Amino acid sequence: DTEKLIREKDEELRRMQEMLEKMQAQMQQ
Amino acid sequence: DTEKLIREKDEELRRMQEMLEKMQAQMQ
Ligand SMILES: [Zn+2]
Ligand SMILES: [Zn+2]
Ligand SMILES: [Zn+2]
Ligand SMILES: [Zn+2]
């Protein structure tokens, strides 16, 4: 399914952005 | 205690490095 494929990939990208965000914060505080 | 502190900070960087590697591999 094409909408499901876009959605699953987009969520994975969102989860990775959040991880990077949490990592950068750890190297600050 | 300085050696213990260095290892604990190293463990945290390794965990971040390892998650970074999973992201790059995952984006294949
Ligand atoms: Zn469809
Ligand atoms: Zn997106
Ligand atoms: Zn889900
Ligand atoms: Zn966020």
Side-chain angles (χ1 to χ4, degrees), chain A residues 1-3 5-6 8-21 23-27, chain B residues 1-3 5-7 10-21 23-28:
Chain A
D1 194 74
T2 298
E3 295 95 326
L5 285 168
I6 290 169
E8 281 172 13
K9 300 243 282 193
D10 200 39
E11 286 174 56
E12 168 177 83
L13 295 184
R14 290 301 175 275
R15 296 191 292 268
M16 295 174 350
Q17 284 176 175
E18 286 309 281
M19 292 178 71
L20 291 175
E21 186 183 347
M23 291 172 41
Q24 272 163 24
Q26 295 202 28
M27 295 185 279
Chain B
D1 183 273
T2 308
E3 297 85 325
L5 239 28
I6 288 169
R7 279 178 316 246
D10 195 32
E11 181 182 302
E12 164 181 27
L13 300 178
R14 287 183 167 141
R15 292 197 283 264
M16 291 180 325
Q17 174 67 12
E18 236 169 338
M19 49 183 72
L20 231 47
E21 293 167 346
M23 293 180 213
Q24 280 131 17
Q26 203 166 3
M27 277 180 289
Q28 317 305 332

